[PDB]
Each structure stands twice: as structure tokens, then as C-alpha cells.
């Protein structure tokens, strides 16, 4: 009756990559079904597989889940990565929605024309240095613990470290004045499930033009 | 301590209105502290009240919560409006993230120039009639029950009916072919907590072209 979740998306990062990270960190093997044409997406739509006619969609535990946050919230709860109580979940949600805001800026960074790419990249770097990285460094500095919330691995650590890898692709110097973020990146990357995902041949997807 | 949540935002709907709806529907009295100037927002920032230097912020249960979804998820769980288990939450989350997508289109609808307002409104109406309203009408039709999930009031019913009022403001005819959505709107609007919120004098905020 099927055990591997099935990920319906493109052979690309896009809006599915944070789900790939979370499942891989939880040690969950999954299947991917790549959209490669208009007819592939039209088939999913006509078959009634997409509640709002869009992907990402994940087949898991008998459901056809769409909307990235619905998918991620279910996976996080199922694999005990969403905190131990609703107050831990509140901190996790606050942290990861800030991460989502920065991640969306990076996802939608224009490539063309060059003067627009340059202008938007400059603003993103300002926000990374002055808003987002200080906020997360401060959480880690305030409790001195190895993880963001509850002194235990959660999805917040996984989502943040994923973002740290994208920020490194934009500008490797941006993390340099944030030693607790660098230490978190190292600690999470050394977890055996995450280290496997970082190896060649994993489902981790490459950048578009980096 | 401080039994009433405190909502920090502008005296406007914006990104705080769905929290006002949810707290009011849950029967929870709250306080508001309105940002009326740049100085107000700067004071919140320099006092360390805003994790990412932005509002909405809600003071609740000893936390200074920012990010609308963090605020709403916590309130929904605290007041037992988030279903009974992980699978019900998956359905709720699916539904309300679709609601959030349509709500965002409406929130960001331009007013100017008129031909652009008209063009993007025409796109929103086509998605309401062809994508979003059919999807929620099918949910109610499939199980035949009074509420979206679990045969019991949840945040999904509250968030959907809120959005039904905004769609009504855009075009009162868009719901006409969706009888189950109309019946849900009437049912939720007649719940005593929601009916009270719909009265003049409640914390419900007006549309911007009126304030």
C-alpha cells in the first residue's frame, strides 16, 4: 500500500527542495516523479491530483498534499521534528517563517537585466548581514545550546542550514562574522543523514546557473 | 501574566486581520496597540520586540511572536481550532494555505492605474471561479458536513469565511454558483462569537478605501 512518499515536481530545486532536505534529514527514502512537459502537469490536474491545480504535491500516507507548508508541517510532525509542545512549535514557526522570507527573496532574485540582478542582490546581502543572520546568531548566543529550539534537533535547524548553503552560493563571506551560525552549519552537516544528502548522487538538486 | 494577547499593528486590516478574526471567533478578548507613526515602529525595533524588525507582532503567553503564520498556528492550537491529529492538521494546512494564496492576491491588488486594477481583478475573479471556490465546494460536497475538517469548527472554517467576506467586497456574484460556500458563510457568521465580531464596534477593521 506504498511506503515511500512520492514527490511530484520538476528536476530542479524550486519549491520542493526544502522538502527534499527535511525528508533526507529524517532518513526517509522517497521517490520523485518529474514533470517534463505541459502534458505531465495537465495529467496531474485532469486526474484530480492537485487540489489547487499546482505543484509541489507529495503523495504520503494516503494523502495528496499540496502547498509547501502543509507538506512540510506534516513531515515535521510525523518525524518528531516540530518540537515537543506548542510553545516550542511557536518558536520554530517564527524562526522558519523568517527563513522562508529570506529564502523567497533568494528564489525570486532576477537574473535579467544585469543592473536589476545587481540591485536586488545588493539588497538581499544587506538583509542577510543586518536582519536575518544577526537574529539567528542572537537566538544561539542567548541559550548557548547546539540547536535552535528545545536543545534538540528540529526542522528549524534543517531549514536554517539549507539556507546557509544557499547564502554561501551567493557570497561565501556573509556568514563570516557569525561564528555560531558557522558552528551550527558544521554540526548539522555532520549528522549522518544530512551528510549523506550532501554527497554526490543524492536527490539534492543543483543550482540553476551556479 | 497579561491574560489578554496584545496585537501590535497599524489601525488597519493588513496582515493582522486574520489574527483578529481567529481570536474573536475563539472567544478570546485581546488588546491592540496601534502603530501610528515611524516613531512607534522604531520604538518596537529598538526595544528588541521584533525578531525580524517587522510587525505583525503578538504578545501572548510570555512570547513576542512575529510572522503571521507563527501567530496563527499558536492561537489555533491553544484554542483547539487546529483539528484533533496530524492528518486533520494536514488537511487544514492544505486548505488554509490555498486561502492564504488567494488572500494575498486580493491584499496586493493594485488600485492604480485603473486599467491595471481592472486587468488584475479579472485574473483574480477567474481564479476564484475556476480554481479556489470549486476546490472548497468539493470538500464540503464530498463529506456533506457542516465544517471543512473533522465535522467540527476549525481555523479553516474561520479563515475561509473571512475570505468570503473579502470576495463579496470585490464582487457579490462570485459566490452565487457555490451553494455550500454560501451556507458555510451563513453558518459561521451566525456563531455567537463571529456574529459579535461582525457587529459595528468590534475590532474588525474596515476596508482601506473607507478609512
Author numbering:
A (entry chain D): 1 to 210
B (entry chain C): 1 to 211
What does the publication say?
Glutathione transferases (GSTs) are promiscuous enzymes whose main function is the detoxification of electrophilic compounds. The isoenzyme hGSTA1-1 is primarily expressed in the human liver but can also be found in various other human tissues. It is a key enzyme in human physiology, since it is involved in the phase II detoxification mechanism of a wide range of electrophilic compounds, such as drugs, carcinogenic metabolites, and environmental pollutants. Cytosolic GSTs are dimeric enzymes with each subunit having two distinct domains: a conserved N-terminal thioredoxin-like α/β domain and a C-terminal α-helical domain.
The improvement in the catalytic activity of hGSTA1-K141H/S142H as well as its thermal stability prompt us to investigate the structure of this mutant at the atomic level using X-ray crystallography. The mutant was crystallized in two crystal forms with four molecules (1.56 Å resolution) and two molecules (1.87 Å), respectively, in the crystallographic asymmetric unit. The high-resolution structure has Cys112 modified to S,S-(2-hydroxyethyl)thiocysteine, owing to longer storage of the enzyme prior to crystallization. Apart from this, the two structures have only subtle differences, with a root mean square deviation (rmsd) of 0.43 Å. Residues 212–221 at the C-terminal were not included in the structure because of high disorder. The engineered amino acids are at the surface of the enzyme. The results showed that the mutant hGSTA1-K141H/S142H exhibits higher catalytic efficiency, thermal stability, and sensitivity against α-endosulfan compared to the wild-type enzyme. The double mutation K141H/S142H, according to the crystallographic analysis, results in subtle but specific changes in the protein structure, and the observed stability may be attributed to specific interactions within an amino acid network. The results demonstrate that the mutant hGSTA1-K141H/S142H depicts higher catalytic efficiency and stability than the rest of the mutants studied; the mutation S142H is likely the main contributor.
